[PDB]
Design a protein around this ligand. Structure first.
Ligand SMILES: CC(=O)N[C@H]1/C(=N/OC(=O)Nc2ccccc2)O[C@H](CO)[C@@H](O)[C@@H]1O
Ligand SMILES: [Ca+2]
Length: 882
């Protein structure tokens, strides 16, 4: 050994009674620790630093277990030293793991799998090593106050000094040019501040007289919109840092000709759903955020949801009410779940966050507010409605809370009673006062716009009056910022008129009609004289598929402007920004007109600048897309139609996610014609990346569509009990998925490995524990979402399903192959079992890039034209009989 038989202790973050953590180290094989929740790990302190040579683990039974062992010599960093990932059963002899004489004062054992239960266990753990004579070192989470930073000095300088602020802005608009099209095009522009045009945001583009482009605008985003206007209408250039670009500039800067002056009737152009921060932006670095804000300003956006670094604000707030930093970390979710954590739906899951997290994200948020200030983009910060942890009373006995029940199998945080009786302590007032103060401490006065949404998708209003709740929440927000505007989401008829009528100051609230392009609900808001924004939702969960509503955008936005007195803006509220760039380009365009436009000729113009060129055939393919996947519909529907490939296998499947659809409302063979045309023009257009993007989009749409048809043939073949029929069609079905995987390999944005690597690398000098945990977050979100009770009982299984390379191969295909094998076995042998899908899915979720399989961050050289012809030939609906 030698075995460390003394001074060793252990902690855990949950257990089923009375299977406490100490039962893992009590020398007794008949006693065990057992997990109760999603913290499936224990932490052994060794009473000093040892050089470990061996670690021995015993489980309570003969099930197959999988786990990862991490160690620390500094008490801060936990690095992986051992793991079990083989399918061998536990037995009476235990598992012995050799350690490379690694210095360790603490150990973590994360038992990520148990073949017999959702719940995990360690009966005993023995650690063998050589005592170093040393002891683990002492360090507390500490963050800077905004006012004490270079950010505050800069922020105030912009605020007080007009000439400085203008210089800063103009220089930023110029840096934007250098980032977007290249440094060599920067001095080809002259940027000027002008006034508003009758109280409206405005830009101008004209010729300087010496071959440069002169652009005027009342602020940053107006300038960047003039820049984009020039690129789009004169340079035939189209920028989308997420969904494909044409950035090929002419040899000479083209002349503007006659001067243009373009204003917008809208006070706000809005961007972001709480969900975007999770489904898309979870693992974004500053570079990705910088890109995004350039694209924002260029698209006219001046109002943007901002929850970056809100974990520090909450930490400082909770610290005042009896919570340690560790307890705060247990409250807050992991980095993929902030959407539903800030919307009061869930706690804990994916966590705990590393100690490093707090400072890094406060800094990222300060960085973002600096650029936003330069552009004149208002962030929407956080308001406070009463959200507290479920043990808030234990720590603050006089506090009055309301249990909020569950959300999709998760426990919702409590909610402080917004008001109490006389003679009762008012903890809404105490905690709200701290919250707004700590939010100032972390970021300063950066905005008058605050977002909070009590009772989002459920909860419980207890004994309280609905209107009185919304009266007090607003009054309190205005208390700490007299100019405050409470940004309120409008989702599925909530908040009701009765909550909304509680708003005593209508000017200081702004309601986001979240789903205005499928299900508008602004009439109720307009009738109550409430300022409101018209929003395109479009995207649910980052689910992919050809789908957009260009005609409604072209018509309904200007029509709403004319039919109303309280529409203060338009915007986007997608759950992910990863799909259908047409929709988002058209919506932000609709801000700069009071008249309806022609969606058909708009598209004709759009595709030319996107591909860099156009022709008769490419146009007619896009008309086919407009006539099919993009055709105006009048039904209710959430998201693009879902692919059967991404569905949990079975009979009578009508979607992949619980409240989704797989119904194709257009003619499939008609849509396939677009792919024929794209393939026919491939060689001419392959120099365009945005063309390849769209080709991959419609081609993977073609194969999703045909897969559905093939699935029904093979289902009919089994239900008719033969047989070698089934083998054939089931085999052609799996072959189709293998072709799909090749299609998806062509796009960097469709690679699972990019999502995952971004998770593992988003902070620097992270230990293996943090990287592994963040990869858990990335895997789980796009698949099971949560654990068994969240995936199954909760309805969240495959909610965020992705048509992604690697994921399709190792997860979607694998599910379908097992089920086929399957039915075949029976049809020949009998009979086919019930497959416990979650088990199989969570197997993949818990795999790690460094020990299991590293997914590529690099696209393939596969030929889409060629791939398209293979699709038309063998895997199409058009040729489906042959
Ligand atoms: C799981 C998830 O992300 N659900 C989101 C969500 N789900 O909406 C649905 O697709 N449908 C659905 C919503 C409520 C009840 C049943 C289905 O939309 C809301 C607004 O975009 C978000 O606030 C919810 O977080
Ligand atoms: Ca024991």
């Amino acid at each position: 050994g030698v075995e460390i038989t003394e001074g060793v202790t252990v902690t855990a973050k949950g257990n089923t009674e009375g299977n406490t953590a100490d039962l893992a180290i009590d020398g007794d094989l008949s006693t065990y620790w057992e997990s109760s929740n999603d913290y499936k790990w224990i932490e052994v302190d060794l009473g000093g630093i040892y050089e470990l040579s061996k670690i021995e683990i015993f489980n309570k039974d003969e099930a197959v277990y999988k786990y990862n062992i991490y160690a620390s010599e500094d008490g801060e960093n936990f690095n992986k030293i051992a793991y079990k990932n083989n399918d061998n059963v536990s037995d009476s002899n235990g598992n012995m793991h050799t350690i490379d004489n690694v210095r360790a004062g603490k150990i973590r054992i994360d038992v990520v799998q148990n073949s017999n239960s959702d719940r995990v266990n360690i009966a005993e753990i023995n650690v063998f090593g050589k005592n170093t004579g040393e002891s683990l070192p002492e360090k507390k989470i500490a963050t800077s106050n905004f006012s004490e930073t270079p950010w505050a000095t800069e922020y105030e300088k912009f605020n007080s000094d007009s000439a400085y602020a203008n210089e800063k802005t103009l220089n930023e608009i110029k840096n934007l040019v250098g980032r977007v099209i290249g440094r060599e095009f920067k001095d080809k522009f002259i940027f000027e501040i002008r006034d508003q045009l009758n109280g409206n945001d405005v830009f101008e583009v004209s010729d300087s007289g010496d071959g440069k482009v002169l652009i005027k605008g009342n602020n940053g985003v107006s300038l960047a919109s003039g820049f984009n206007y020039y690129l789009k209408n004169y340079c035939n250039v189209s920028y989308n840092p997420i969904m494909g670009s044409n950035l090929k500039m002419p040899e000479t800067m083209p002349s503007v000709g006659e001067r243009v002056v373009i204003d917008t009737p809208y006070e706000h152009r809005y961007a972001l759903n709480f969900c975007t921060y999770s489904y898309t932006m979870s693992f974004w670095d500053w570079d990705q955020y910088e890109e995004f804000l350039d694209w924002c300003a260029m698209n006219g956006v001046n109002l943007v949801l901002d929850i970056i670094g809100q974990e520090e604000v909450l930490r400082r707030t909770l610290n005042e009410f009896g919570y340690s930093d560790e307890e705060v970390k247990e409250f807050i979710s992991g980095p993929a779940y902030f959407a539903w954590f800030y919307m009061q739906n869930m706690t804990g899951f994916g966590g705990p966050l590393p100690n490093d997290w707090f400072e890094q994200r406060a800094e990222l948020g300060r960085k973002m507010h600096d650029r936003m200030q330069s552009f004149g983009i208002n962030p929407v910060l956080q308001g406070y409605s009463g959200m507290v942890p479920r043990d808030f009373k234990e720590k603050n006995q006089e506090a009055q809370t309301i249990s909020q029940g569950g959300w999709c199998g998760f426990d919702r945080p409590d909610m402080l009673k917004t008001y109490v009786n006389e003679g009762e302590a008012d903890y809404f007032q105490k905690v709200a006062d701290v919250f707004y103060e700590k939010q100032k401490e972390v970021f300063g006065d950066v905005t008058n716009f605050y977002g909070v949404d009590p009772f989002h998708e459920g909860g419980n209003t207890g004994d309280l009056d609905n209107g009185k709740i919304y009266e007090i929440i607003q009054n309190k927000m205005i208390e700490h910022d007299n100019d405050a505007v409470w940004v309120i989401q409008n989702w599925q008829g909530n908040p009701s008129n009765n909550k909304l009528e509680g708003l005593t100051k209508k000017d200081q609230a702004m309601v986001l009609d979240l789903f205005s392009e499928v299900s508008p609900d602004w009439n109720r808001l307009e009738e109550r004289d409430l300022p409101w924004i018209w929003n395109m939702l479009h995207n649910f969960g980052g689910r992919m598929g050809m789908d957009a509503a260009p005609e409604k955008l072209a018509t309904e936005i200007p029509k709403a402007l004319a039919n109303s007195e309280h529409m203060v803006g338009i915007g986007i509220t997608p759950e992910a920004i990863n799909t259908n760039p047409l929709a988002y380009e058209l919506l932000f365009d609709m801000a700069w007109t009071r008249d309806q436009i022609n969606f058909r000729t708009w598209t004709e113009d759009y595709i030319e600048r996107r591909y860099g060129k156009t022709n008769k055939e490419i146009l007619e393919a896009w008309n086919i897309i407009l006539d099919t996947a993009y055709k105006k519909r009048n039904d209710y529907y959430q998201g693009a139609a879902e692919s059967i490939i991404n569905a949990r296998p079975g009979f009578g499947i009508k979607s992949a996610s619980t409240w989704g659809h797989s119904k194709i409302v257009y003619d499939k063979s008609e849509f396939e014609k677009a792919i024929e045309i794209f393939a026919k023009n491939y060689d001419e257009f392959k120099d365009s990346d945005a063309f390849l993007y769209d080709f991959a989009d419609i081609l993977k749409q073609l194969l999703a569509n045909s897969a559905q048809e093939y699935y029904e043939v093979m289902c009919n073949a089994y239900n008719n009990g033969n047989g070698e029929k089934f083998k054939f069609v089931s085999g052609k079905f799996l072959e189709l998925i293998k072709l799909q995987e090749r299609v998806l390999s062509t796009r960097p944005e469709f690679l699972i490995g990019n999502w995952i690597e971004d998770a593992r690398t988003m902070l620097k000098d992270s230990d293996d524990w943090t990287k592994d945990l963040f990869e858990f977050n990335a895997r789980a979100l796009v698949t099971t979402w949560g654990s068994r009770n969240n995936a199954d009982g909760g309805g969240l299984k495959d909610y965020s399903n992705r048509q992604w390379s690697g994921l399709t191969e190792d997860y979607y295909y694998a599910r379908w192959e097992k089920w086929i094998n399957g039915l075949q076995a029976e049809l020949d042998g009998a009979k086919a079992p019930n497959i416990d899908w979650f088990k199989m899915e969570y197997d993949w979720v818990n795999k790690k890039s460094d020990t299991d399989k590293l997914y590529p961050t690099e696209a393939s050289n596969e030929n889409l034209g060629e791939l398209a012809k293979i699709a038309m030939e063998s895997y199409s609906v058009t040729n489906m009989d042959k």
